[PDB]
């Protein structure tokens with residue numbers, strides 16, 4: 008039941024220290040690949056960060072966050088969220104695997120966009136969310152947990168340089184066997200978010 | 205869910221068969237259970253049933269004509285207008301179409317700072333997770349669906365029709381399927397994955 012995984016899925020921030028096999032990662036990515044996308048453009052690209060390169064990753068992250076703390080960053084209206092970003096770095100350090108998700112069709116966050124450009128971003132970004140959600144749900148099916156991460160935006164330039172990518176950085180997802188079982192997070196009810204016409 | 209992820213197709217032919225309200229609620233409930241950045245839950249849903257179908261279709265056709273008349277918002281995408289017209293015909297066949305809004309969204313006509321972009325990107329991913337949950341739940345229930353951004357060819361017209369100041373993200377049409385498409389092409393793992 009996908010309904011079962013949809014209901015049971017949680018953001019997991021404590022993991023078992025146990026390695027995840029390449030094959031398990033393969034299965035999760037191949038669920039992402041099966042997402043729908045605008046014009047079947049499939050704009051998602053993935054960079055799997057293993058133990059090999061984790062420390063270097065985390066250093067780039069931390070440099071970006073420090074740059075933000077120093078007021079040389081990109082999110083001056085979100086200083087209250089820097090503490091959360093530092094917590095996410097810790098979670099990424101402990102998680103056995105983190106996968107970066109890129110948008111090969113993405114334009115820089117630093118550039119100003121026409122309405123048409125915005126619509127392409129919106130379409131592609133939604134599509135990538137479908138992929139990452141597929142990955143998340145597949146992790147649940149496999150007995151893993153995951154955490155979807157946009158705190159990487161506090162080190163946007165630094166991580167794009169680290170990745171040496173010409174693509175737009177969208178997110179990371181950390182994965183592993185879970186070491187917590189959170190109850191359902193708060194949600195607005197269907198009456199709060201739906202208008203029937 | 206692995207079954208539904210695999211089996212899911214974009215469906216563009218529908219039976220003439222209504223959907224119960226509780227079925228629609230189950231689909232929306234799946235959406236609500238998506239993750240979202242800061243648990244902001246930016247999605248809002250407007251469910252369009254047969255009573256308002258014609259009015260919907262008229263607003264979207266208006267926008268499409270405005271694009272054809274070079275008075276639209278996607279002048280670089282004229283080659284895609286024919287597809288948008290086909291989407292209108294598909295929305296006509298579906299018993300239900302749900303519009304998905306981003307209550308936190310800025311107009312496509314406004315210019316965004318890097319920080320505003322990041323917030324949009326995070327919200328848009330979140331809404332994609334919701335709409336994918338809806339799509340997968342439709343499959344599980346024996347329904348089909350079509351995720352729609354061709355609505356952008358009538359962005360202003362549809363926001364006016366919906367009487368909303370929120371950002372229009374997408375529509376999803378829902379119904380009992382009258383086709384069973386073969387898998388659509390996909391890139392392979394090697395094409396999209398780098399290992400570090």
Ligand SMILES: Cc1cc2nc3c(=O)[nH]c(=O)nc-3n(C[C@H](O)[C@H](O)[C@H](O)COP(=O)(O)O)c2cc1C
Pocket residue numbers: 042043044045046047130131133134137212213214215216291350351352353354355374385387388
């Ligand atoms: C964000 C998004 C927007 C889409 N917009 C439309 C649309 O307006 N009309 C349409 O016929 N299909 C639309 N699609 C469906 C895609 O064409 C379809 O997902 C892609 O061709 C892959 O086919 P599949 O979904 O059957 O695997 C959209 C899909 C997504 C994810």
Ligand SMILES: Cc1cc2nc3c(=O)[nH]c(=O)nc-3n(C[C@H](O)[C@H](O)[C@H](O)COP(=O)(O)O)c2cc1C
Pocket residue numbers: 016017018019020095154155156157158159189191192237238239240241242243326327329330333
């Ligand atoms: C696009 C997106 C970005 C997110 N970014 C982070 C993040 O950087 N760090 C974190 O701890 N959680 C992050 N989350 C997880 C959310 O906080 C979580 O989905 C929300 O609190 C609801 O909890 P649940 O997923 O357990 O239902 C993100 C989720 C999404 C969808």
Ligand SMILES: [Cl-]
Pocket residue numbers: 044045046047
């Ligand atoms: Cl499409």
Ligand SMILES: [Cl-]
Pocket residue numbers: 240241242243
């Ligand atoms: Cl968050």
